[PDB]
């Protein structure tokens, strides 16, 4: 619910969130997977104007056109595989708050089309009747693809694109924030040292160095794996070079 | 007269819109996506005669053959996708009104046949019965496709092509209307400066000059975004060059 | 109704009358855009089921299913409340199937059985009903071609290609166009309560030499557009659809000049100086005028 | 309900039907489409031992795996698209008679499999319960494909094949029976002359000659088209050279 | 002892069939289609111990993933394909019996998993519930496929492969059993000469000689047909060379 | 239960104990055919949810759907009468998912969410249930490889590949085989009430040098076959499955002779006469013996 910051790139990013977050503008978070995009969504909601109002958030990852539609929009008893107990929806659930859809770069056209209207004109029809149901949400999308490319590739639309990529933040990699790793590191060292009830404290100066120096391709995701691993493997108190994943040495 | 007025092209379009609009003739509005087809629709609606009636309008965008069939036409208990209270339809809904179907270019073949039946002989069955509901609608249609090529490539059929493309209107691209840009600009500058409670007013002559020679590719849509962005970044009063998207506008 | 007197159009009438007498099946061939439905209407009119109803459906796109039904019919509580059928609907009549070259295989088999031995089951049960229908069907598709490709089958094909009428294109009946043209100019001047009357000899001249690809449908469109736009009394060149006019639509100075300064070039062996001289402009200019 | 016969090949064929028809053997009629295979099925049923018992006959042409199953076998109220009024079936309907399936060369595997058991062991389960329902039918299949090929192509099975191709008759083309055409010809000349209520009688010696000499690729199917055509076109009494399809002259 | 007896191979097979049959071990009968796998199944059934119980048997031939699931296992109201009275199943049906699944080689993956569950841990859910019905079945399986290659090609999985192919029996092809042919022949010659009320008896030494050196490709199935045909053509008493299929037997 | 003492097998135990303590997720890698399920059982046994139940499902083939359900569960009247779920079923326990490298994408996303933040919705509604499960999952698939190919995803992968145990092959643990071998020889001699006891040093010798591809499963099969067939007291070479023996299975005279008469040939420079002479047969014979 915060971040481990400054290193140059890390700073710039903080600068942007600060500047932009004031409520109305939709926001597109771009960057490879592995870096706290979620977090940067968090930081957005927090820093501007609806810091007290809810922060709805779903991940469109792989839910099929159908499920997604419903989950996003609304839905009543008349839906084809046996469940009848009207579901509100998320956009609504956020009405007057903040919606955060993650991994948007692959929604089906149709959903692009809907998602558009969603944003275009405050309305939101439930999966069913003309429940024109207007709403008022501040949107924040995230993805790791070249939306611009998707557009030209013809898999994604201008209209939606041009309505999402209003204010764009670009997520720097773990590598672009060496300076944090250590501190970031300790953070998990503590979560899991506890989760396994293991007494652990401190990295040996050697490991922290390789740590500070590696963790590229799955930035946090990667580190967070590499640590939890050490603590579970650790027979003593300080995680060392031989408690870290092979790709520690396997990289030089 | 909704849209930000004249520049030659922009003048020729109101000129077309005016001559054409007395009800009966179907209209096909063709043009790069990103410009005011929709408004042009409304304006068409407005100006001519059924100005009092409602303006039904549906976007064919990506509605499966099925949902569109129903969405457009009729369907009572039949569909069977869960709860079937009856859905009247859109054509009917417009009856004695005006219908606007956007993005009609990718509709499935069968839908072509049907749509043509709705234009050819004013009746309108429904997704199920021989409920031949007669309607009388002014049809207005848009696409960003070269209907003709589609016709020739075998994906869209002439009969329909020839009953939609009776009286054609080419939306002009933003670039084909520089003279407006500025005027268009200010317009967005007011809406967003209001939407953000920001005290903004004016564009530095420099900034304005660029806006004036770009905003090609995603005509209004892109402009519209390029300005809101600028209002949202603006620290002070007049949006300038360093508040516009870097984005190859000057690159 | 059919307007005609030009050789082709004449021959076609000759054919209609000849063949009309009821028993034989009649397949109509020709680009869409010309009165095939009418030619079927005409057929229907001419010999002896003149009084009976004229069932007619267009196989358009109809999914195999709805087509099967519409065509034969499930009169018994199959899908859960009933439709008789169209063949039956014509029993003792004349059936007109349109755009028949895209019916699926299954359908081809069925349609044939129904042509081969007068019966017509209904979908999914053995409701062995029997009929007698005069068949008239037409398509814009090279049936043979469909056969050899294997998307259509001989049996049906040979039972359909019994009596052949080839609908002629407008380009093949110029002489009519004006008469035709006038016909539409009358309908839409009325439908729009505009007071139009006549084509400028110029317009009418283009109309007589074009109107090809969508034979009647495209002309019908062309005029209708023309009356809708007309702000005066005679429809003229600048009311007919662009397509009817290197070309005759305005093209940009910039381009036309490069077109000119390249011709001059060609006619002086690439000698710029001379080109410019005759062109009445500085060598430096021509250099630019085309390096724009 | 008879045939126009002898020309050599035409004779041989008659010889086979005569010889084979005695009831039990299944029979496979091979030959291009266009020649009276149906008829030869007829002649079979007629000439041997169940000439008084029914002659059930369906064409498997294009009915989908489902419809076919049902139509062939039996079926009760529990079938998926709304019709409940138990259907008997055909094999049954023939029980103790003669079944004639036409254009078999394309049934789906599954149907091959069933059709097999059908023939293998007299039973026939209705599309539903264990309606083991034995039966006793004499089978006669027809097709225009190289069943032998289909087998090797792997689209059809040995077991079924070897149970259908017990006694095989090969259908000669119209061309292999010149001698009949004329007489065959007259036959239709009469059907349609009547069906159109047209007074017609006789071919001009010239047409009958081209007739006797053409009509290859869609043997009867073809002729039967070419005639009906003449009568409908005929303005007089004898069909001539200019009443026959273009492919009359279009062939030399 | 159903089948027409010995020739070396034919002797080695009864020899296998005899040693193997005391209930517990699963058997995989492999061989060109066209020979007596089925009988070999029966014989297996017969000879060993559950000789009194019924011999359930289903052919997996071409039953969609779905129909086979149910056909093999359980399914109550669930399936929903029309009328759902409950279908017990085949495994259960054999419970304390013997199951024979022919043509098991093309069954879908999921079916592999399931089938293995039925062999691995004797329970058997049904198409729907957690109705863990325990059964105890002797399994017997046939195919004309090289399970191994299939395993290696990734279309069939080892675990199952290794619980079916415990004790393998290679059906020998007709050619691998000349010594029988004659005996086999007479057998069909009696059934068909009876089926046709024909007074037939014997094969000319010539005819017999050929039968003896052919009938390869479609082992019994082909022979079986080649003889019925001959009885059906026979005009007189002893089937001879000109009563057998031309068919490349001597070509 | 697990039988062992050979280096690899030893190392594996060493790993199990080391890692067992509950919090961390454990992914098991290794060709199918070796005790991965057991290794999971062992894991489960060793540190602190020793007493709680051990939910375990094998993702086998299960269609996306039934898997989704089985795995999370629709406890609310979705499909029309209920199933809780398997994650829940383990809440405060240890989950064992088997063959996890073929779960679909959607599933990958879900499984992850369920690993990432302890909740578990149920299919189609927002029944936001929360849990805590120790995860143990295994597959015979090169996860990385699946990632780079794009059929599997990093996020999940990096959350699964936390703690890695590589199940070793039999070929890598020969020393066990006999001990192992004896174990099965005991089960099936019993299950068939046969009185077997011991392997001929010959058989046991082959067993020790083979049993590869289906590690334990193929050995388990091999023996079982051997006891079923044994008509005597010691299982021997000629009771083990063919595959365990150019080769060692009888091959036909005809072939072996051509094999011999070609060697002789090779060793006399293709001189037939000589080949035959040494071969003790007429030149004319050799000519035939291989032109068969």
mmCIF file with all atom_site columns, N, CA and C in Angstrom, chain C residues 62-105:
data_model
loop_
_atom_site.group_PDB
_atom_site.id
_atom_site.type_symbol
_atom_site.label_atom_id
_atom_site.label_alt_id
_atom_site.label_comp_id
_atom_site.label_asym_id
_atom_site.label_entity_id
_atom_site.label_seq_id
_atom_site.pdbx_PDB_ins_code
_atom_site.Cartn_x
_atom_site.Cartn_y
_atom_site.Cartn_z
_atom_site.occupancy
_atom_site.B_iso_or_equiv
_atom_site.pdbx_formal_charge
_atom_site.auth_seq_id
_atom_site.auth_comp_id
_atom_site.auth_asym_id
_atom_site.auth_atom_id
_atom_site.pdbx_PDB_model_num
ATOM 1   N N  . UNK C 1 62  ? -30.657 -17.525 -45.328 1.00 0.00 ? 62  UNK C N  1
ATOM 2   C CA . UNK C 1 62  ? -31.281 -18.484 -44.413 1.00 0.00 ? 62  UNK C CA 1
ATOM 3   C C  . UNK C 1 62  ? -30.469 -19.700 -44.006 1.00 0.00 ? 62  UNK C C  1
ATOM 4   N N  . UNK C 1 63  ? -30.243 -19.854 -42.708 1.00 0.00 ? 63  UNK C N  1
ATOM 5   C CA . UNK C 1 63  ? -29.416 -20.953 -42.285 1.00 0.00 ? 63  UNK C CA 1
ATOM 6   C C  . UNK C 1 63  ? -30.115 -22.192 -42.729 1.00 0.00 ? 63  UNK C C  1
ATOM 7   N N  . UNK C 1 64  ? -29.322 -23.191 -43.091 1.00 0.00 ? 64  UNK C N  1
ATOM 8   C CA . UNK C 1 64  ? -29.872 -24.479 -43.477 1.00 0.00 ? 64  UNK C CA 1
ATOM 9   C C  . UNK C 1 64  ? -31.221 -24.756 -42.799 1.00 0.00 ? 64  UNK C C  1
ATOM 10  N N  . UNK C 1 65  ? -31.272 -24.578 -41.476 1.00 0.00 ? 65  UNK C N  1
ATOM 11  C CA . UNK C 1 65  ? -32.455 -24.948 -40.708 1.00 0.00 ? 65  UNK C CA 1
ATOM 12  C C  . UNK C 1 65  ? -33.688 -24.164 -41.113 1.00 0.00 ? 65  UNK C C  1
ATOM 13  N N  . UNK C 1 66  ? -33.732 -22.905 -40.703 1.00 0.00 ? 66  UNK C N  1
ATOM 14  C CA . UNK C 1 66  ? -34.871 -22.062 -41.012 1.00 0.00 ? 66  UNK C CA 1
ATOM 15  C C  . UNK C 1 66  ? -35.284 -22.219 -42.460 1.00 0.00 ? 66  UNK C C  1
ATOM 16  N N  . UNK C 1 67  ? -34.319 -22.369 -43.363 1.00 0.00 ? 67  UNK C N  1
ATOM 17  C CA . UNK C 1 67  ? -34.661 -22.662 -44.747 1.00 0.00 ? 67  UNK C CA 1
ATOM 18  C C  . UNK C 1 67  ? -35.442 -23.989 -44.859 1.00 0.00 ? 67  UNK C C  1
ATOM 19  N N  . UNK C 1 68  ? -34.890 -25.055 -44.294 1.00 0.00 ? 68  UNK C N  1
ATOM 20  C CA . UNK C 1 68  ? -35.565 -26.341 -44.363 1.00 0.00 ? 68  UNK C CA 1
ATOM 21  C C  . UNK C 1 68  ? -37.019 -26.138 -43.979 1.00 0.00 ? 68  UNK C C  1
ATOM 22  N N  . UNK C 1 69  ? -37.229 -25.606 -42.779 1.00 0.00 ? 69  UNK C N  1
ATOM 23  C CA . UNK C 1 69  ? -38.569 -25.350 -42.293 1.00 0.00 ? 69  UNK C CA 1
ATOM 24  C C  . UNK C 1 69  ? -39.317 -24.487 -43.294 1.00 0.00 ? 69  UNK C C  1
ATOM 25  N N  . UNK C 1 70  ? -38.992 -23.206 -43.332 1.00 0.00 ? 70  UNK C N  1
ATOM 26  C CA . UNK C 1 70  ? -39.688 -22.323 -44.244 1.00 0.00 ? 70  UNK C CA 1
ATOM 27  C C  . UNK C 1 70  ? -40.086 -23.079 -45.502 1.00 0.00 ? 70  UNK C C  1
ATOM 28  N N  . UNK C 1 71  ? -39.115 -23.733 -46.121 1.00 0.00 ? 71  UNK C N  1
ATOM 29  C CA . UNK C 1 71  ? -39.356 -24.476 -47.353 1.00 0.00 ? 71  UNK C CA 1
ATOM 30  C C  . UNK C 1 71  ? -40.293 -25.683 -47.307 1.00 0.00 ? 71  UNK C C  1
ATOM 31  N N  . UNK C 1 72  ? -40.084 -26.594 -46.371 1.00 0.00 ? 72  UNK C N  1
ATOM 32  C CA . UNK C 1 72  ? -40.964 -27.761 -46.312 1.00 0.00 ? 72  UNK C CA 1
ATOM 33  C C  . UNK C 1 72  ? -41.889 -27.531 -45.147 1.00 0.00 ? 72  UNK C C  1
ATOM 34  N N  . UNK C 1 73  ? -41.342 -27.495 -43.954 1.00 0.00 ? 73  UNK C N  1
ATOM 35  C CA . UNK C 1 73  ? -42.184 -27.110 -42.859 1.00 0.00 ? 73  UNK C CA 1
ATOM 36  C C  . UNK C 1 73  ? -42.267 -28.192 -41.844 1.00 0.00 ? 73  UNK C C  1
ATOM 37  N N  . UNK C 1 74  ? -42.334 -27.747 -40.606 1.00 0.00 ? 74  UNK C N  1
ATOM 38  C CA . UNK C 1 74  ? -42.564 -28.612 -39.486 1.00 0.00 ? 74  UNK C CA 1
ATOM 39  C C  . UNK C 1 74  ? -43.964 -28.186 -39.072 1.00 0.00 ? 74  UNK C C  1
ATOM 40  N N  . UNK C 1 75  ? -44.965 -28.990 -39.389 1.00 0.00 ? 75  UNK C N  1
ATOM 41  C CA . UNK C 1 75  ? -46.322 -28.596 -39.057 1.00 0.00 ? 75  UNK C CA 1
ATOM 42  C C  . UNK C 1 75  ? -46.699 -29.299 -37.785 1.00 0.00 ? 75  UNK C C  1
ATOM 43  N N  . UNK C 1 76  ? -45.841 -30.232 -37.395 1.00 0.00 ? 76  UNK C N  1
ATOM 44  C CA . UNK C 1 76  ? -46.037 -31.007 -36.187 1.00 0.00 ? 76  UNK C CA 1
ATOM 45  C C  . UNK C 1 76  ? -45.057 -30.581 -35.106 1.00 0.00 ? 76  UNK C C  1
ATOM 46  N N  . UNK C 1 77  ? -45.602 -30.312 -33.925 1.00 0.00 ? 77  UNK C N  1
ATOM 47  C CA . UNK C 1 77  ? -44.863 -29.855 -32.761 1.00 0.00 ? 77  UNK C CA 1
ATOM 48  C C  . UNK C 1 77  ? -43.403 -30.221 -32.595 1.00 0.00 ? 77  UNK C C  1
ATOM 49  N N  . UNK C 1 78  ? -42.600 -29.952 -33.621 1.00 0.00 ? 78  UNK C N  1
ATOM 50  C CA . UNK C 1 78  ? -41.159 -30.167 -33.538 1.00 0.00 ? 78  UNK C CA 1
ATOM 51  C C  . UNK C 1 78  ? -40.578 -29.147 -32.553 1.00 0.00 ? 78  UNK C C  1
ATOM 52  N N  . UNK C 1 79  ? -40.139 -27.996 -33.061 1.00 0.00 ? 79  UNK C N  1
ATOM 53  C CA . UNK C 1 79  ? -39.595 -26.938 -32.207 1.00 0.00 ? 79  UNK C CA 1
ATOM 54  C C  . UNK C 1 79  ? -40.695 -26.313 -31.345 1.00 0.00 ? 79  UNK C C  1
ATOM 55  N N  . UNK C 1 80  ? -40.507 -26.326 -30.025 1.00 0.00 ? 80  UNK C N  1
ATOM 56  C CA . UNK C 1 80  ? -41.493 -25.775 -29.092 1.00 0.00 ? 80  UNK C CA 1
ATOM 57  C C  . UNK C 1 80  ? -41.215 -24.308 -28.770 1.00 0.00 ? 80  UNK C C  1
ATOM 58  N N  . UNK C 1 81  ? -47.722 -21.843 -32.731 1.00 0.00 ? 81  UNK C N  1
ATOM 59  C CA . UNK C 1 81  ? -46.786 -22.954 -32.611 1.00 0.00 ? 81  UNK C CA 1
ATOM 60  C C  . UNK C 1 81  ? -46.727 -23.847 -33.854 1.00 0.00 ? 81  UNK C C  1
ATOM 61  N N  . UNK C 1 82  ? -46.769 -23.255 -35.049 1.00 0.00 ? 82  UNK C N  1
ATOM 62  C CA . UNK C 1 82  ? -46.584 -24.054 -36.270 1.00 0.00 ? 82  UNK C CA 1
ATOM 63  C C  . UNK C 1 82  ? -46.501 -23.308 -37.619 1.00 0.00 ? 82  UNK C C  1
ATOM 64  N N  . UNK C 1 83  ? -45.737 -23.893 -38.545 1.00 0.00 ? 83  UNK C N  1
ATOM 65  C CA . UNK C 1 83  ? -45.606 -23.410 -39.921 1.00 0.00 ? 83  UNK C CA 1
ATOM 66  C C  . UNK C 1 83  ? -45.809 -24.561 -40.924 1.00 0.00 ? 83  UNK C C  1
ATOM 67  N N  . UNK C 1 84  ? -46.747 -24.391 -41.854 1.00 0.00 ? 84  UNK C N  1
ATOM 68  C CA . UNK C 1 84  ? -47.074 -25.394 -42.872 1.00 0.00 ? 84  UNK C CA 1
ATOM 69  C C  . UNK C 1 84  ? -45.899 -25.738 -43.790 1.00 0.00 ? 84  UNK C C  1
ATOM 70  N N  . UNK C 1 85  ? -45.507 -24.775 -44.604 1.00 0.00 ? 85  UNK C N  1
ATOM 71  C CA . UNK C 1 85  ? -44.443 -24.988 -45.555 1.00 0.00 ? 85  UNK C CA 1
ATOM 72  C C  . UNK C 1 85  ? -44.713 -24.130 -46.765 1.00 0.00 ? 85  UNK C C  1
ATOM 73  N N  . UNK C 1 86  ? -43.739 -24.024 -47.659 1.00 0.00 ? 86  UNK C N  1
ATOM 74  C CA . UNK C 1 86  ? -43.906 -23.180 -48.831 1.00 0.00 ? 86  UNK C CA 1
ATOM 75  C C  . UNK C 1 86  ? -44.169 -23.986 -50.086 1.00 0.00 ? 86  UNK C C  1
ATOM 76  N N  . UNK C 1 87  ? -43.674 -25.208 -50.121 1.00 0.00 ? 87  UNK C N  1
ATOM 77  C CA . UNK C 1 87  ? -43.947 -26.032 -51.265 1.00 0.00 ? 87  UNK C CA 1
ATOM 78  C C  . UNK C 1 87  ? -45.417 -26.321 -51.188 1.00 0.00 ? 87  UNK C C  1
ATOM 79  N N  . UNK C 1 88  ? -45.818 -26.868 -50.053 1.00 0.00 ? 88  UNK C N  1
ATOM 80  C CA . UNK C 1 88  ? -47.221 -27.135 -49.832 1.00 0.00 ? 88  UNK C CA 1
ATOM 81  C C  . UNK C 1 88  ? -47.980 -25.859 -50.158 1.00 0.00 ? 88  UNK C C  1
ATOM 82  N N  . UNK C 1 89  ? -47.568 -24.743 -49.567 1.00 0.00 ? 89  UNK C N  1
ATOM 83  C CA . UNK C 1 89  ? -48.289 -23.493 -49.776 1.00 0.00 ? 89  UNK C CA 1
ATOM 84  C C  . UNK C 1 89  ? -48.569 -23.240 -51.249 1.00 0.00 ? 89  UNK C C  1
ATOM 85  N N  . UNK C 1 90  ? -47.808 -23.909 -52.105 1.00 0.00 ? 90  UNK C N  1
ATOM 86  C CA . UNK C 1 90  ? -47.978 -23.703 -53.531 1.00 0.00 ? 90  UNK C CA 1
ATOM 87  C C  . UNK C 1 90  ? -48.680 -24.864 -54.190 1.00 0.00 ? 90  UNK C C  1
ATOM 88  N N  . UNK C 1 91  ? -48.891 -25.942 -53.454 1.00 0.00 ? 91  UNK C N  1
ATOM 89  C CA . UNK C 1 91  ? -49.498 -27.105 -54.092 1.00 0.00 ? 91  UNK C CA 1
ATOM 90  C C  . UNK C 1 91  ? -50.579 -26.683 -55.084 1.00 0.00 ? 91  UNK C C  1
ATOM 91  N N  . UNK C 1 92  ? -50.366 -27.087 -56.329 1.00 0.00 ? 92  UNK C N  1
ATOM 92  C CA . UNK C 1 92  ? -51.265 -26.738 -57.399 1.00 0.00 ? 92  UNK C CA 1
ATOM 93  C C  . UNK C 1 92  ? -50.987 -25.326 -57.833 1.00 0.00 ? 92  UNK C C  1
ATOM 94  N N  . UNK C 1 93  ? -49.813 -24.832 -57.471 1.00 0.00 ? 93  UNK C N  1
ATOM 95  C CA . UNK C 1 93  ? -49.420 -23.489 -57.836 1.00 0.00 ? 93  UNK C CA 1
ATOM 96  C C  . UNK C 1 93  ? -48.079 -23.461 -58.540 1.00 0.00 ? 93  UNK C C  1
ATOM 97  N N  . UNK C 1 94  ? -47.310 -22.412 -58.261 1.00 0.00 ? 94  UNK C N  1
ATOM 98  C CA . UNK C 1 94  ? -46.023 -22.172 -58.889 1.00 0.00 ? 94  UNK C CA 1
ATOM 99  C C  . UNK C 1 94  ? -45.084 -21.605 -57.846 1.00 0.00 ? 94  UNK C C  1
ATOM 100 N N  . UNK C 1 95  ? -43.961 -22.274 -57.656 1.00 0.00 ? 95  UNK C N  1
ATOM 101 C CA . UNK C 1 95  ? -43.004 -21.853 -56.662 1.00 0.00 ? 95  UNK C CA 1
ATOM 102 C C  . UNK C 1 95  ? -41.862 -21.078 -57.280 1.00 0.00 ? 95  UNK C C  1
ATOM 103 N N  . UNK C 1 96  ? -41.474 -20.003 -56.601 1.00 0.00 ? 96  UNK C N  1
ATOM 104 C CA . UNK C 1 96  ? -40.343 -19.201 -57.029 1.00 0.00 ? 96  UNK C CA 1
ATOM 105 C C  . UNK C 1 96  ? -39.250 -19.127 -55.979 1.00 0.00 ? 96  UNK C C  1
ATOM 106 N N  . UNK C 1 97  ? -38.230 -19.963 -56.139 1.00 0.00 ? 97  UNK C N  1
ATOM 107 C CA . UNK C 1 97  ? -37.084 -19.864 -55.260 1.00 0.00 ? 97  UNK C CA 1
ATOM 108 C C  . UNK C 1 97  ? -36.006 -18.968 -55.896 1.00 0.00 ? 97  UNK C C  1
ATOM 109 N N  . UNK C 1 98  ? -35.527 -18.007 -55.105 1.00 0.00 ? 98  UNK C N  1
ATOM 110 C CA . UNK C 1 98  ? -34.579 -17.015 -55.557 1.00 0.00 ? 98  UNK C CA 1
ATOM 111 C C  . UNK C 1 98  ? -33.215 -17.238 -54.936 1.00 0.00 ? 98  UNK C C  1
ATOM 112 N N  . UNK C 1 99  ? -32.187 -16.961 -55.728 1.00 0.00 ? 99  UNK C N  1
ATOM 113 C CA . UNK C 1 99  ? -30.829 -17.147 -55.294 1.00 0.00 ? 99  UNK C CA 1
ATOM 114 C C  . UNK C 1 99  ? -30.785 -18.547 -54.760 1.00 0.00 ? 99  UNK C C  1
ATOM 115 N N  . UNK C 1 100 ? -30.784 -19.501 -55.672 1.00 0.00 ? 100 UNK C N  1
ATOM 116 C CA . UNK C 1 100 ? -30.815 -20.894 -55.297 1.00 0.00 ? 100 UNK C CA 1
ATOM 117 C C  . UNK C 1 100 ? -29.455 -21.547 -55.336 1.00 0.00 ? 100 UNK C C  1
ATOM 118 N N  . UNK C 1 101 ? -28.453 -20.808 -55.755 1.00 0.00 ? 101 UNK C N  1
ATOM 119 C CA . UNK C 1 101 ? -27.176 -21.449 -55.901 1.00 0.00 ? 101 UNK C CA 1
ATOM 120 C C  . UNK C 1 101 ? -26.400 -21.454 -54.629 1.00 0.00 ? 101 UNK C C  1
ATOM 121 N N  . UNK C 1 102 ? -26.995 -21.088 -53.501 1.00 0.00 ? 102 UNK C N  1
ATOM 122 C CA . UNK C 1 102 ? -26.216 -21.146 -52.250 1.00 0.00 ? 102 UNK C CA 1
ATOM 123 C C  . UNK C 1 102 ? -26.845 -22.046 -51.196 1.00 0.00 ? 102 UNK C C  1
ATOM 124 N N  . UNK C 1 103 ? -27.857 -22.803 -51.616 1.00 0.00 ? 103 UNK C N  1
ATOM 125 C CA . UNK C 1 103 ? -28.503 -23.654 -50.683 1.00 0.00 ? 103 UNK C CA 1
ATOM 126 C C  . UNK C 1 103 ? -27.452 -24.690 -50.360 1.00 0.00 ? 103 UNK C C  1
ATOM 127 N N  . UNK C 1 104 ? -27.512 -25.269 -49.176 1.00 0.00 ? 104 UNK C N  1
ATOM 128 C CA . UNK C 1 104 ? -26.518 -26.209 -48.742 1.00 0.00 ? 104 UNK C CA 1
ATOM 129 C C  . UNK C 1 104 ? -26.746 -27.467 -49.468 1.00 0.00 ? 104 UNK C C  1
ATOM 130 N N  . UNK C 1 105 ? -25.806 -28.388 -49.346 1.00 0.00 ? 105 UNK C N  1
ATOM 131 C CA . UNK C 1 105 ? -25.973 -29.747 -49.847 1.00 0.00 ? 105 UNK C CA 1
ATOM 132 C C  . UNK C 1 105 ? -27.249 -30.319 -49.348 1.00 0.00 ? 105 UNK C C  1
#
